[PDB]
Amino acid sequence: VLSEGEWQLVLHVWAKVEADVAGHGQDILIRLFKSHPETLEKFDRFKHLKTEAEMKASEDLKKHGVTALTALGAILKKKGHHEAELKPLAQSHATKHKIPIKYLEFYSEAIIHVLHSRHPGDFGADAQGAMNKALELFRKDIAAKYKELGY
Ligand code: HEM
Ligand SMILES: O=N[O-]
Ligand SMILES: O=N[O-]
Fold this sequence. Notes:
Keywords: Cytoplasm, Heme, Iron, Metal-binding, Muscle protein, Oxidoreductase, Oxygen transport, Phosphoprotein, Transport. It is found in: Cytoplasm, Sarcoplasm. By secondary structure, the chain is mainly α. The protein is 77% helix and 0% strand. It has 8 helices and no strands. The protein is globular. The protein binds protoporphyrin IX containing FE (HEM) and nitrite ion (NO2) (2 copies). Protoporphyrin IX containing FE (HEM) binds next to α5, α6 and α7.
C-alpha cells in the first residue's frame, strides 16, 4: 500500500545508494555481520573474516555487496510489482542459503542504520517512513514464499 509520494521518496533515497553502491553494500554487510554474528556464519564465502578491518579490506565482500544491492534496487524500482524479481531470491534464500526471515529483518535494520550514518541530516523522517514501508513489503512478499516452502 505505498503511495506514489512514498515510492518517490524511496527511489530518491535509493539514488543516494546508487552514487556509491559498493560503499553502501559493504557498510550494510559489515553492520549486519557485527550486529548479528550469526548472519556471517551463513556465508561460507565470508566466514573466514573475523575483524571489521578484515571485512573492510575484502574486495570480494564489496563485490557481493554490489550484487545484493543491485537486486534490491531493481526490486524497489518495480514499486511493488516485483513477483518475477523476488521469486528467485525467495527460492535461493529459503532453500539453498537457508536464511531465516528474521535475518531479513536484521538486513533491513542495517540498511536504515547505514543510510543515517552516510547521510546525516539528509535522510528525512518522511523518507525513513517510506523506506520502512518498502522494506516491509519486500519482507512480507518473501515471507509468503518461505511459508509456501515450509520455511
Ligand atoms: C535485502 C535482502 C537481500 C537481497 C536483496 C539479497 C540478494 C542476494 C543476491 C542477488 C544473491 C546472489 C543470487 C542468489 O543466490 O540468489 C545473494 C546471495 C546470497 N545471499 Fe542474499 N540477499 C539478501 C539478504 C540476505 C541475508 C540477510 C543473508 C544472510 C544472513 C543472505 C545470504 C546470502 C548468501 C549466503 C548468498 C550466496 C553468496 C555466495 O556464496 O556467493 N542474503 N543474495
Ligand atoms: O548480501 N546478501 O546476500
Ligand atoms: O543494524 N541494525 O541497527
